[PDB]
């Protein structure tokens, strides 16, 4: 069992890209098993031209890695397709 607090941040040239990326990576869109989503606090918001992702999780180590791998894949694909 682990307790994790994660914050990821990155920046774009414009506010519109940050707003588009922040909306794209909503937890509702990510292929995390629905059971794992229940015990996960995941929020993404734009702050000017910057994107901020905040994760809070408590549970098994293996589920943390799954959650984070899914999130990073979603972020990377959102950047590739929308930005």
PDB file of C-alpha atoms in Angstrom:
ATOM      1  CA  UNK A   1       0.000   0.000   0.000  1.00  0.00           C
ATOM      2  CA  UNK A   2       1.166   3.506  -0.984  1.00  0.00           C
ATOM      3  CA  UNK A   3      -0.109   7.101  -0.685  1.00  0.00           C
ATOM      4  CA  UNK A   4       0.890   9.235  -3.719  1.00  0.00           C
ATOM      5  CA  UNK A   5       0.574  12.935  -4.563  1.00  0.00           C
ATOM      6  CA  UNK A   6       1.640  13.831  -8.134  1.00  0.00           C
ATOM      7  CA  UNK A   7       1.718  17.150  -9.985  1.00  0.00           C
ATOM      8  CA  UNK A   8       2.725  17.422 -13.661  1.00  0.00           C
ATOM      9  CA  UNK A   9       3.221  20.696 -15.522  1.00  0.00           C
ATOM     10  CA  UNK A  10       4.135  21.842 -19.052  1.00  0.00           C
ATOM     11  CA  UNK A  11       3.659  24.978 -21.176  1.00  0.00           C
ATOM     12  CA  UNK A  12       2.452  26.055 -24.645  1.00  0.00           C
ATOM     13  CA  UNK A  13       2.993  29.238 -26.755  1.00  0.00           C
ATOM     14  CA  UNK A  14      -0.742  30.116 -26.379  1.00  0.00           C
ATOM     15  CA  UNK A  15      -3.671  29.915 -23.876  1.00  0.00           C
ATOM     16  CA  UNK A  16      -6.022  28.191 -26.421  1.00  0.00           C
ATOM     17  CA  UNK A  17      -3.650  25.156 -26.767  1.00  0.00           C
ATOM     18  CA  UNK A  18      -3.397  24.894 -22.915  1.00  0.00           C
ATOM     19  CA  UNK A  19      -7.228  25.045 -22.604  1.00  0.00           C
ATOM     20  CA  UNK A  20      -7.662  22.373 -25.381  1.00  0.00           C
ATOM     21  CA  UNK A  21      -5.004  19.971 -23.864  1.00  0.00           C
ATOM     22  CA  UNK A  22      -6.364  20.459 -20.269  1.00  0.00           C
ATOM     23  CA  UNK A  23      -9.931  19.569 -21.370  1.00  0.00           C
ATOM     24  CA  UNK A  24      -8.689  16.579 -23.493  1.00  0.00           C
ATOM     25  CA  UNK A  25      -6.995  14.709 -20.651  1.00  0.00           C
ATOM     26  CA  UNK A  26     -10.141  14.654 -18.408  1.00  0.00           C
ATOM     27  CA  UNK A  27     -10.210  11.323 -16.374  1.00  0.00           C
ATOM     28  CA  UNK A  28     -13.582  10.490 -18.150  1.00  0.00           C
ATOM     29  CA  UNK A  29     -11.632  10.074 -21.482  1.00  0.00           C
ATOM     30  CA  UNK A  30      -8.782   7.888 -20.113  1.00  0.00           C
ATOM     31  CA  UNK A  31      -8.753   4.027 -20.437  1.00  0.00           C
ATOM     32  CA  UNK A  32      -8.038   3.486 -16.668  1.00  0.00           C
ATOM     33  CA  UNK A  33     -10.140   0.470 -15.298  1.00  0.00           C
ATOM     34  CA  UNK A  34     -13.343   2.026 -13.850  1.00  0.00           C
ATOM     35  CA  UNK A  35     -12.638   0.280 -10.484  1.00  0.00           C
ATOM     36  CA  UNK A  36      -9.201   2.068 -10.243  1.00  0.00           C
ATOM     37  CA  UNK A  37     -10.885   5.447 -11.219  1.00  0.00           C
ATOM     38  CA  UNK A  38     -13.129   5.168  -8.087  1.00  0.00           C
ATOM     39  CA  UNK A  39     -10.043   5.323  -5.760  1.00  0.00           C
ATOM     40  CA  UNK A  40      -8.245   8.027  -7.815  1.00  0.00           C
ATOM     41  CA  UNK A  41      -8.392  11.822  -7.630  1.00  0.00           C
ATOM     42  CA  UNK A  42      -7.310  13.174 -11.043  1.00  0.00           C
ATOM     43  CA  UNK A  43      -7.800  16.806 -12.170  1.00  0.00           C
ATOM     44  CA  UNK A  44      -6.246  18.800 -15.073  1.00  0.00           C
ATOM     45  CA  UNK A  45      -6.685  22.587 -15.546  1.00  0.00           C
ATOM     46  CA  UNK A  46      -5.142  25.391 -17.687  1.00  0.00           C
ATOM     47  CA  UNK A  47      -3.235  28.278 -15.984  1.00  0.00           C
ATOM     48  CA  UNK A  48      -2.645  30.765 -18.780  1.00  0.00           C
ATOM     49  CA  UNK A  49      -0.497  28.982 -21.402  1.00  0.00           C
ATOM     50  CA  UNK A  50       0.464  26.239 -18.851  1.00  0.00           C
ATOM     51  CA  UNK A  51      -1.274  22.890 -18.159  1.00  0.00           C
ATOM     52  CA  UNK A  52      -1.354  21.515 -14.565  1.00  0.00           C
ATOM     53  CA  UNK A  53      -2.274  17.852 -13.761  1.00  0.00           C
ATOM     54  CA  UNK A  54      -2.854  16.855 -10.104  1.00  0.00           C
ATOM     55  CA  UNK A  55      -3.130  13.207  -9.004  1.00  0.00           C
ATOM     56  CA  UNK A  56      -3.900  11.880  -5.518  1.00  0.00           C
ATOM     57  CA  UNK A  57      -4.018   8.099  -5.008  1.00  0.00           C
ATOM     58  CA  UNK A  58      -4.014   5.585  -2.110  1.00  0.00           C
ATOM     59  CA  UNK A  59      -3.824   1.835  -2.751  1.00  0.00           C
ATOM     60  CA  UNK A  60      -1.583  -0.887  -4.233  1.00  0.00           C
ATOM     61  CA  UNK A  61       1.733  -0.009  -5.966  1.00  0.00           C
ATOM     62  CA  UNK A  62       0.794  -1.881  -9.248  1.00  0.00           C
ATOM     63  CA  UNK A  63      -2.439   0.162  -9.609  1.00  0.00           C
ATOM     64  CA  UNK A  64      -0.461   3.470  -9.222  1.00  0.00           C
ATOM     65  CA  UNK A  65       1.855   2.501 -12.165  1.00  0.00           C
ATOM     66  CA  UNK A  66      -1.222   1.492 -14.314  1.00  0.00           C
ATOM     67  CA  UNK A  67      -2.967   4.809 -13.479  1.00  0.00           C
ATOM     68  CA  UNK A  68       0.129   6.943 -14.269  1.00  0.00           C
ATOM     69  CA  UNK A  69       0.987   4.990 -17.511  1.00  0.00           C
ATOM     70  CA  UNK A  70      -2.613   5.568 -18.747  1.00  0.00           C
ATOM     71  CA  UNK A  71      -2.442   9.299 -17.835  1.00  0.00           C
ATOM     72  CA  UNK A  72       0.959   9.868 -19.541  1.00  0.00           C
ATOM     73  CA  UNK A  73      -0.288   8.039 -22.694  1.00  0.00           C
ATOM     74  CA  UNK A  74      -3.464  10.274 -22.743  1.00  0.00           C
ATOM     75  CA  UNK A  75      -1.321  13.491 -22.298  1.00  0.00           C
ATOM     76  CA  UNK A  76       1.176  12.431 -25.023  1.00  0.00           C
ATOM     77  CA  UNK A  77      -1.571  11.493 -27.574  1.00  0.00           C
ATOM     78  CA  UNK A  78      -3.581  14.727 -26.762  1.00  0.00           C
ATOM     79  CA  UNK A  79      -0.369  16.759 -27.497  1.00  0.00           C
ATOM     80  CA  UNK A  80       0.337  14.786 -30.740  1.00  0.00           C
ATOM     81  CA  UNK A  81      -3.233  15.088 -32.150  1.00  0.00           C
ATOM     82  CA  UNK A  82      -4.520  18.497 -30.812  1.00  0.00           C
ATOM     83  CA  UNK A  83      -1.262  20.547 -30.478  1.00  0.00           C
TER      84      UNK A  83
END
